[PDB]
Structure 1
Amino acid sequence: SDEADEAYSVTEQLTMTGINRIRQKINAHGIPVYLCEACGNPIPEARRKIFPGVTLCVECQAYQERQRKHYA
C-alpha cells in the first residue's frame, strides 16, 4: 500500500471527477435554438458556432453565473 499509493488513488478520483463535471457542463452537441431563452434576443452567430446549443446570450449567461457564484 505504501501510504502514497492510496493517496494516488484518492488524487486520481478527485481530479477525474472534477474534470468530468467541468466537461459535462459544456453540452457541445445540441439544438440550434437561435434565440435567447431569457430575453429572446438574437444569440449572435459566433456564440452559437463556438457553443453549439447555447440557451442564453452572454449577458444573461454572465448574470446567471453571478447568482450561481454566490449560491441558490
Structure 2
Amino acid sequence: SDEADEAYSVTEQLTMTGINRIRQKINAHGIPVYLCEACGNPIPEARRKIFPGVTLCVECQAYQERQRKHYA
C-alpha cells in the first residue's frame, strides 16, 4: 500500500541480510589449530577462548583483513 508501508519491508530486508552476513562471518565450532596458519605460530588461548574456531593469530588475521579491504 502506502510507500512507507512497503519501504519498511525494503529496509528490514536490507538490514536482516546485513545482520545475517555479519553474524555468519564468525566461525562457529571446530578443533582450534593452536597455531596461526600463516605463521604456524601459537594463537594464545584467550583468543582461542573468545571465538571458538579461530585459525589465525592477530597479526596474520590483521594482514588478511587489510588485504580483503581492497576487495581483491
Query: Does TM-score exceed 0.5, indicating one fold?
Result: yes
- Taking structure 2 as the reference length, the TM-score comes to 0.94
Q: In structure 1, how many angstroms separate the alpha carbons of the residues matched to 2:58 and 2:6?
A: 43
Q: In structure 2, how many angstroms separate the alpha carbons of the residues matched to 1:43 and 1:30?
A: 15
How far has the Cα of 1:25 moved from its partner? 0.4
How far has the Cα of 1:33 moved from its partner? 1.5
Paired residue secondary structure (2:35): coil
CA deviations 1:9-61 (Å, max 9, x no partner) are 00010000000000000123222211111100000010000111111100000
Root-mean-square deviation over aligned CA pairs: 0.9
- Taking structure 1 as the reference length, the TM-score comes to 0.94
Q: In structure 2, how many angstroms separate the alpha carbons of the residues matched to 1:38 and 1:20?
A: 28
Greater strand percent: which structure? 2
Task: Say whether residues 1:7 and 2:7 are aligned partners.
Answer: yes
Provide the residue aligned with 2:30 in structure 1.
Answer: 30
Q: How many pairs does the alignment contain?
A: 72
Aligned-pair identity (%): 100
For structure 2, the 5+ residue unaligned runs are none
CA contact (8 A) 2:32 2:55 kept: no
Provide the residue aligned with 1:39 in structure 2.
Answer: 39
